[PDB]
Amino acid sequence: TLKSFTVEKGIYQTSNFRVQPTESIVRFPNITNLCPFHEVFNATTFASVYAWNRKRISNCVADYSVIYNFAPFFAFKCYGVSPTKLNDLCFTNVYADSFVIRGNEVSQIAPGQTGNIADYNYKLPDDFTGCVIAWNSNKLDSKPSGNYNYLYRLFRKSKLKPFERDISTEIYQAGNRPCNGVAGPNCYSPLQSYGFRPTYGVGHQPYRVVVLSFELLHAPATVCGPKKSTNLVKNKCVNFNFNGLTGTGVLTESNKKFLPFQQFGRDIADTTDAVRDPQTLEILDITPCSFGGVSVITPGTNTSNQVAVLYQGVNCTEVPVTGSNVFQTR
């Protein structure tokens, strides 16, 4: 610590001692169902972008490594998470939105974007967490005469809110004379059709987009991936994994008055003090394991090589997990 080969007489702060964790436990809710990602990704017909579908996914075990075998996409583009860490932690609810756009507008399916799809068809929030999966569908959504089954909206009086749908078909008022349901000068239909042909370029080919939106933990968790649970152990320094919340500490029984809608308890420094066990509805206090500073009292190295050790702020009965002369100071 001193970066020297000789030590003068005095007391020196060297390091810290820390009680190492012994066991590791995982506490996940008991859920046996499997999430239907196959019914979302494998479908004959996909919805239009102005009338995008939304499927709720809850109360099932989600395996995110089987998505790669369902659709031929390059990358699993995510924003708040990573694709390789989706199987470990877990959420409250999953929302799957599926639609068909062109290759120009794939860049507009992103938080904080401005364009046609982002302003009038499908808007993502600024604090969006989740993943976007887009892949080419030129062999399924395109015909050499011209597919007209996919629509998009570009005439509206205001920009869309995030996760807001608009399926109304009323004639847009672009001038002063009222339309009265009849198109004409300064009166246009708000929905126009795509013109997908297989002889088109790669930037104008149809693309199927599925957006997975995750709800982070505020409620008891309903969608959790394949990790086996472990028996709960108390009054011991262990590693714990409560619904994807990892940590190290000692779990003790609690007398905190948790309200029935409350699952977590936080500190002043924004760390978890109490947890609710998902299998048995119990409240557990978490405390850090025993630690403190270590000081080394020595004379000079030209005098002696004998040392004394001062463990700071900890009692004399808790220091392990001459030198037989244990003394208790303040």
Partner: protein, 99 residues
């Protein structure tokens, strides 16, 4: 009457309380909890967010220690004045006006 020693206690309480309360800050990261960052992301992105948190907490710690050094200089000046007053007021008789 004893407001100076009360301020001495209160400043050392307030500095430590601010140092603890600065641990809840994000400093431009996605979360203030280190384990949530290490669990949500892969290695490179969590390294970026951990670097942001490290820079913010290091800046807070350096600010605390600089304020402590200035306060220690002021306390040492007051202690020098108190030692001079003990040497010249208690151990003898002083002719200095208002000393």
């Amino acid at each position: 009457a004893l407001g100076k020693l009360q301020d001495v206690v209160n400043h050392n309480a307030q500095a430590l309380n601010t140092l603890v309360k600065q641990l809840s800050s994000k400093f431009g990261a996605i979360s203030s909890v280190l384990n949530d960052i290490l669990s949500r992301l892969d290695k490179v992105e969590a390294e970026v967010q951990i670097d942001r948190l490290i820079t913010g907490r290091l800046q807070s710690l350096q600010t605390y220690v600089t304020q402590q050094l200035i306060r220690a200089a002021e306390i040492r000046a007051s202690a020098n004045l108190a030692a001079t007053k003990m040497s010249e007021c208690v151990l003898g008789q002083s002719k200095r006006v208002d000393f």
